[PDB]
Design a protein around this nucleic acid. Structure first.
Lengths: 116, 87, 66, 51, 104
RNA sequence: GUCUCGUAGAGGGGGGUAGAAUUCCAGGUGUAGCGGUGAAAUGCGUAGAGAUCUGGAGGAAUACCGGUGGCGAAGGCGGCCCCCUGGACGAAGACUGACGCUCAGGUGCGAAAGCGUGGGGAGCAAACAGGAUUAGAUACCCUGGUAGUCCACGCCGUAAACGAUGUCGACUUGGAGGUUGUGCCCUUGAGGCGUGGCUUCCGGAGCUAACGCGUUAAGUCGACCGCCUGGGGAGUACGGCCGCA
RNA sequence: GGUAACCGUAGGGGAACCUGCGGUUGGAUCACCUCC
């Protein structure tokens, strides 16, 4: 239908379900997947092995939109979540630029209290 | 206050205009600060921090006046009428 | 090494972009004084000047703007 | 960080995040920052003077 | 009597009228016995981050000695105009006259 | 104690203003789950969610510099700018001429929590609703969530309000460090010699029951204030003052 | 480079104690031959 070539991707490295999105550098979303969309549940879903599957679902659904080059935006504290960008790299898209977009605040809202 | 305004009072109440030590010039300067400064708290009521310096100045004024009373009542009285002090 | 005691500043201008960009880090933060070795007074002057300059758009707040 | 580098690829060059970021941020910011007892939490640096 | 540094921002759409305003504002300053030691017209400049969905702006700077009453009037005349974008005021220690290190 | 010239400083009120961040609303894309803990559920779900982009409304606090750094009588003070304002210190003299120290009563200031009248209300969050679980069981855990938290204008006046060390002076070997002033050498540049503030840590005489303090004394002395007299009962009772409680 | 037991205060409830806001270091339990 449409050709994107040098798209952009967005990942949300939450401790829970990781979000991966493909975007065409204009805000309109091409495709999307979770570690939870395949029926994964519980702590089997938080290991870095789990984030790969969503990356390959995104890649193999977005073939028709024709990604050739790509950008990726990463925010989150989740450890080792760049396994997703390993998966996109291995999927054949030429990943050219990377930025960390973690929403740090300048000490605004008050964070929730901790458990003992 | 300002150096220009301070210079006039020392020349007025002073013996020779470089003397600046006789208790008259001191008490005159202190009054000059307080009467102007009273207009600060007309709307800056909340300021509790410069009040400490204000009360220090008024205490020092009264304390030098109580020093004058023990040395010569004449210039004390002339001074208080010149400045309009109550007591 | 320090530039202030060698090049000469009794006061530092906030529009001097060279000595300003020299002390900002890769992502717009301020370098700590223990890394660079500047005197405390001058470090305090830098910290004030550069935060005016951010207001004056001579610097960005963070690199996340393209 | 804007990562742009020479032509070799897939090294990912984030091995120095240890000093390129205060990495504890978002480990200590999504939770009530305690910050109390702070200076004696800096105290341990003095304890090491020895000869 | 004190001296001030002032810098402001203007919409690039109003480029033709930047120096007409410069002259008008310095006339307003000088009419109440104002004096100026430095004035720079830095001209067009790219912004470090977009403000008001804009990307370029026109820089103006001057160092003035003036009485405090006129500054608030002049600032309000900034704020009420359409074409102003940002402003800044500063009180300085001494009447500096040497040209601004930007121009180098 | 006063005047002259300067310096550093989150010392205080008022008004603007900025960027990051958090909800909510609107408009696209787009698929069906999202959210959460060691595991699940509750709850939103396709009268179209989250994820992403843009616009807008609104509230609170100022990442980075930032430190046994600074200011303050104490409590405590942290974006930027402007207006108003207190104190400290240094150089060189000049002047006043014992004007001083302490202070029962008294006045004022005094973290947070709490009340009263009216605003505003993003997030967080005593109480409350629900889900879950162990080993008593309500509570620790997770969804929501009212007061409160914020601003006016008033009360309350207590804290491990602690350096557990009242205030003010004088005298007695050292060493190293921070911060802020300032003289000097023929300044042959960021270097050397000296001299003032405020602070930090080792340690000598001395003191101490010891721990330890140690020129910022808990050392040797002087002036005045407050307090103590075995543990519990008890900072409780009955009075008085204060307070809307 | 997570070691808390206390304070002042307000809502809860009872062998007992919990939380919301702020503050301090004084950061741990003992010295039991025959009935335990």
């Amino acid at each position: 239908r449409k050709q994107v070539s040098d798209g952009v991707a967005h990942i949300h490295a939450s401790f829970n379900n990781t979000i991966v999105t493909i975007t065409d550098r204009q805000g309109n979303a091409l495709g999307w997947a979770t570690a939870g969309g395949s029926g994964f549940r519980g702590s089997r879903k938080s290991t870095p092995f789990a984030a790969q599957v969503a990356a390959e679902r995104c890649a193999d659904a977005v073939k028709e939109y024709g990604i050739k080059n790509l950008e990726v935006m990463v925010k989150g504290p989740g450890p080792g979540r760049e396994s997703t960008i390993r998966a996109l790299n291995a999927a054949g898209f030429r990943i050219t630029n990377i930025t960390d977009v973690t929403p740090i605040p300048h000490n605004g809202c008050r964070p929730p209290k901790k458990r003992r | 206050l300002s150096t220009e305004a301070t210079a006039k009072i020392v020349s007025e109440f002073g013996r020779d205009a470089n003397d600046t030590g006789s208790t008259e010039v001191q008490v005159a300067l202190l009054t000059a600060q307080i009467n102007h400064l009273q207009g600060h708290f007309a709307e800056h009521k909340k300021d509790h921090h410069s009040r400490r310096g204000l009360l220090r100045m008024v205490s020092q004024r009264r304390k030098l006046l109580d020093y004058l009373k023990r040395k010569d009542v004449a210039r004390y009285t002339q001074l208080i009428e010149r400045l309009g002090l109550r007591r | 090494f320090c530039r202030f005691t060698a090049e000469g500043v009794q006061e530092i201008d906030y529009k001097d972009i060279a000595t300003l960009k020299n002390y900002i880090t890769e992502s717009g933060k301020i370098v700590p004084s223990r890394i660079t070795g500047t005197r405390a007074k001058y470090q305090r002057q830098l910290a004030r000047a550069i935060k005016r300059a951010r207001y004056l758009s001579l610097l960005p707040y963070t690199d996340r703007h393209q | 960080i804007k990562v742009r580098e020479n032509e070799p690829f897939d090294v990912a060059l984030r091995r120095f995040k240890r000093s390129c970021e205060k990495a504890g941020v978002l480990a200590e910011v999504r939770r009530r920052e305690f910050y109390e007892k702070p200076t004696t939490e800096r105290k341990r640096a003095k304890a090491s003077a020895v000869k | 009597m004190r001296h001030y540094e002032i810098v402001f921002m203007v919409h690039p759409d109003q480029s033709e009228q930047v120096p007409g305003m410069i002259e008008r504002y310095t006339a307003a300053i000088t009419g109440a016995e104002g004096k100026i030691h430095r004035l720079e017209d830095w001209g067009r400049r790219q912004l470090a981050y977009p403000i008001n969905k804009l990307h370029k702006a026109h820089y103006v700077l001057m160092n003035v000695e003036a009485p405090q009453e006129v500054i608030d009037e002049l600032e309000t005349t900034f704020r009420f105009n359409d074409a102003v974008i940002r402003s800044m005021v500063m009180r300085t220690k001494h009447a500096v006259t040497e040209a601004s290190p930007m121009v180098k």
